[PDB]
């Protein structure tokens, strides 16, 4: 199927306590693979997946220098934005960026993205055309103007279409055993009493990769909507994921309800009941 290279970038000011904290975290699909953190003992880009250990010193030096350069740019940004918004020098503020590209199963670009936020709100983003910006407020319009005069969209477009795609392909190649693998979910159902002759049935799915999964409860070939609780799919500490979905059903009628688990690694979806 399709595949993604994504960078999550965060810069956070801390007036009175030194320079901002700056972090870059990289993912191929749902797997963390590189990280830079300014508060580490020796700040440098580091592998977060064993397959990246194959990249030689020149990769690490080039990425580390890009990261220290980005740290300095975001440091400047934080200061600039205080001015755009007429803010005091004494408060903590956050810039976030998501940056990357998605290619299809044929290796070609499906979409590229570059979205910025300030203090948790949309600021500026590159449009799907890869040519023009969309600005969320009057401050971001200053950035938009700066970036148009500089030809920033054309430089960003060259990265999204060339560099980003080409490095995604390389990463998929170098880590294919890990990245192209499929780990199947293992499922079970648990039972919990409630007041007034009601019970919670909770359906668990464990040990799966990729993260994308769907869990549903049925009654008579009918997917339940009401009384449903769930958690967002979540990492389990070893590069696999887990999830659960529960429903409140009347005491003694547990045997009517079925949990259904759908995943890329299953030849057929799983159906299961309380036991």
């Amino acid at each position: 199927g399709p595949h993604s290279l994504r960078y999550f970038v965060t810069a956070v000011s801390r007036p009175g306590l030194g320079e901002p904290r700056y972090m870059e975290v990289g993912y191929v699909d749902d797997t963390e693979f590189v990280r830079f953190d300014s508060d580490a003992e020796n700040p440098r880009y580091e592998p977060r997946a064993r397959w990246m250990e194959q990249e030689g010193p020149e990769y690490w030096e080039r990425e580390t220098q890009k990261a220290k350069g980005n740290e300095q740019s975001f440091r400047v940004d934080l200061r600039t934005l205080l001015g755009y918004y007429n803010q005091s020098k004494g408060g903590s503020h956050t810039i976030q960026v998501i940056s990357g590209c998605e290619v299809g199963s044929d290796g070609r670009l499906l979409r590229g993205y570059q979205q910025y936020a300030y203090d948790g709100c949309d600021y500026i983003a590159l449009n799907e055309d890869l040519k023009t910006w969309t600005a969320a407020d009057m401050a971001a319009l200053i950035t938009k103007h700066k970036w148009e005069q500089a030809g920033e969209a054309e430089r960003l477009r060259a990265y999204l279409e060339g560099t980003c795609v080409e490095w995604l392909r390389r990463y998929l190649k170098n880590g294919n055993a890990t990245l192209l693998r499929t780990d199947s979910p293992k499922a079970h159902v648990t039972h919990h009493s409630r007041p007034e002759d009601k019970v919670t049935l909770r359906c668990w799915a464990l040990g799966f990769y990729p993260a994308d999964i769907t869990l549903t409860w049925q009654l008579n070939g009918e997917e339940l909507i009401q009384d449903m609780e769930l958690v967002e799919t979540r990492p389990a500490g070893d590069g696999t994921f887990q999830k659960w979905a529960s429903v409140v059903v009347p005491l003694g009628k547990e045997q009517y309800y079925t949990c259904h688990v759908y995943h890329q690694g299953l030849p057929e979806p799983l159906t299961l009941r309380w036991e």
Binding site: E63, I124, A150, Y159
Partner: peptide, 8 residues
């Protein structure tokens, strides 16, 4: 590989 970001 990460982008080299512009100032805002």
């Amino acid at each position: 590989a990460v982008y080299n970001f512009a100032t805002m």
